[model samples]
Target chain A: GPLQDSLEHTLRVAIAHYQDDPDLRFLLDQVQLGLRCCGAASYQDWQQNLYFQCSSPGVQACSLPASCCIDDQCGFGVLRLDADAAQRVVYLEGCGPPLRRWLRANLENLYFQ
Target chain B: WGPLQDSLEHTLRVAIAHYQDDPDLRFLLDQVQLGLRCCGAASYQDWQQNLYFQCSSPGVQACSLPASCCIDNDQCGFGVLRLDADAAQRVVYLEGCGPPLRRWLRANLENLYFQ
Candidate 1:
């Protein structure tokens, strides 16, 4: 089942993959900061705001703000990304390969795993 | 990567599901004795005169000396079976689990939306 979990986690990394751009990176950083500052308390609050801010018809393309839509859409549905899935995707995609390798090496240490 | 891997993992599981008769087994193995023999043969002449005559025939007995062997091995590379497309096709022919898992997931995609 670890393999199953790992493979699923890998796919999340793939789906969340985005082009590297300064503006998008800044937005992502802001989102990360918000989550870190608010921790668990702000999850639902953030989701509600995010869904309302976006989610217009024909605006649901899989890019930037639209990526958030995918995240929100998935969140609203049964397929929520648990902490591990979210963290691993970020760790693998946002960071460089060395960091990703480090994360993978210590994956078992993370309670999320 | 997580979604794609999940998709592929789902694909593999679907393949496994179709071969429901052997649900309890954890792995599958295929022996490459014929390939090995072909590798070992000294020349095309040897293959034509000796090895090919005994091992190249179709529908050989599973237990026959020259038969290719397959087994379920629990250990895997990178937690994957590392199958090529041709190997995948062969396994699919066995009515194994991969195809069905894929079908089920695709059919119920909305039901199992991934984050």
Candidate 2:
């Protein structure tokens, strides 16, 4: 549940723009960066975000966070909107399943003890 | 065996039902509910059987169930009739914990026995 929650939120989140929740942006960045993941499941999930929208005017526009790719040379998150680049660079995996499984395993541990 | 599990469930329900008004039990229950992210032993409605939780009782919690029953901040109504109300479903877990909790217990017991 948390995996889904965090992913959905991270995809749509406006990074560091809101005065009320700059921490959300920071946290999202940390999760993606540390985990080396793109969106919750794939690079495409960022399409829903305004800043990352393909129609955006700036270089950061239509681009995802660089954390999705292993190397800084990746073009996955750029405003150019290259799915091929995404495939070559960013991880295609969703963050929901593995995390949920991990949580379930931990909960099951309680039953054993 | 089925016999032990039946007795275990019975004892658990009785302990929860009997100690509804006990401050110590209440404390224990709240902690359990919060930690487990669960409601009563069987269901959220199980708390209604409590002497103090009843609507007729003159208490602040009379018209409300424990806040811990919901994952979100729910303004849960205390009355049994509210269980059918919209706010109840929108705000609370209407499903009985008894079934799931029992299933988990049975599985765990079976796992333990088989182990």
Candidate 3:
């Protein structure tokens, strides 16, 4: 669980800076695609981002990242919609649980003796 | 298999949890970290779980890492935890002791099992 805890923090920090950092964006996108998951713990975790917070005045406010969607454009403006509608467009599950599962399974496979 | 892993992991956390108050644990931790060139239980940030070393602690060592995690300077870990991960890795071992130490233990166990 410590491993997951560390990674969750990393994902959260990366999320906070997701708008400016291309490398972090890439990392998050790749992990999202590979893991078939969305935000740190859920799709709603995007609210932690300065640009995506529902209360932010920016046009991008209350929006999910393209990485969270089934397709890049699928996530556009979906944050304004109800949870069910948003779930239809983008991944609603968080990346943390999937990541933890992946890590434990792979590490166990490798370490099994 | 799961039981042994649980035991080892629990022991590792207990050691880290008491790292400040227990000199014996501190000694063993220093030796393990120095010998293995490793840091926390699962990553360098695992030190955050320690009461005295957590980022919010008011003590002088608050937000500091164990000196054993440092690459060279005994004081390198001081306030080092406040830095970003990119900056922190330059000063100390960012990798965790858990996997490497597990490998070490497994290898020794294999040797003993065969012997």
Candidate 4:
């Protein structure tokens, strides 16, 4: 329930990318990790949502559901928007759904192991 | 020279202040000093040559007078020269000066002094 193992595996994969020589291999590894961390069901849900959004020609990228925002400005979904001056923190902005999904996949593999 | 040295000191303090965390501050300061020493060494020979040449250049013309003026005290004023040349040279050399000095201080601190 805690997803501690998955989180640790995700972190390990993230750090490994910095050292991995082959770019494609590193990227694949990162994506797998993302998927594992996020879990299969969540990964599938994200993929479905992304596919649906991308079908519309003009859409640049899929926006995270409003539930994702944890902080007042942040949502439970991966992407978060904020205009706060004092905190002004923009977490999960760089690691969007695609990246997170990849990380989750990799973490899921580790969990199976 | 005093003001220049003071400014350098102030800059050093500011640079050090940039890394607020103790471990990070120490790490960055060490790197900064290493950079300073490297800069100093790289430019040392060229800087010496330019300084010597500028300081020793002879006056272009002697002030000749009917009356009297001791040769030593004569207005053998240096040439009517553009000061910008020396200023430019100094500015160019000053580019690499900071990094080397910082490096030297950092090494000294890390290897022997700070310990």
Top-TM-score candidate index: 3
Docking class of 1: incorrect
Candidate 3 residue runs with Cα over 4 Å from true position:
A1-113, B1-6, B110-115
lDDT of 2 by residue, B10-115 (tens): 5545645766556676575555555444556545566666665656667776746776565444445345334432234344444334444455566677567652
Estimate, for each residue in A4-93, the C-alpha lDDT of model 1 and write its tens digit: 345434423332332344564354434333222111121212232332223423333311232322123432321134322232222111
Q: Residue A71's C-alpha lDDT in candidate 4?
A: 30
Interface RMSD of 4: 22.2
DockQ of each: 0.01, 0.01, 0.03, 0.01
**B79: Cα error in model 1, Å:** 13
Candidate 3, pairs of clashing residues:
A41-A94
DockQ of 4: 0.01
Residue range A5-101, candidate 4, lDDT tens digits: 4544443343234334456335433443433222122211222333213342433223332222223223222322211110122112122334444
* Model 4, runs deviating above 4 Å: A1-60, A70-113, B1-115
Residue B13 of model 1 has an lDDT of 38
- Give lDDT tens digits, candidate 4, residues B1-115: 3554445555544433343345564465445434332112222122222222223445323111101111113332222123222122221221233434544555566567332
The alpha-carbon deviation from the true structure for residue A15 of candidate 1, after best TM-score superposition, in angstroms, is 12
The alpha-carbon lDDT assigned to residue A36 of candidate 2 equals: 50
Instruction: Assess chain B of each prediction and give its TM-score.
Output: 0.22, 0.58, 0.84, 0.23
lDDT of 1 at A109: 79
Q: What range of 10 consecutive residues in model 3 chain B has the weakest lDDT sum?
A: B1-10
Top candidate by DockQ: 3
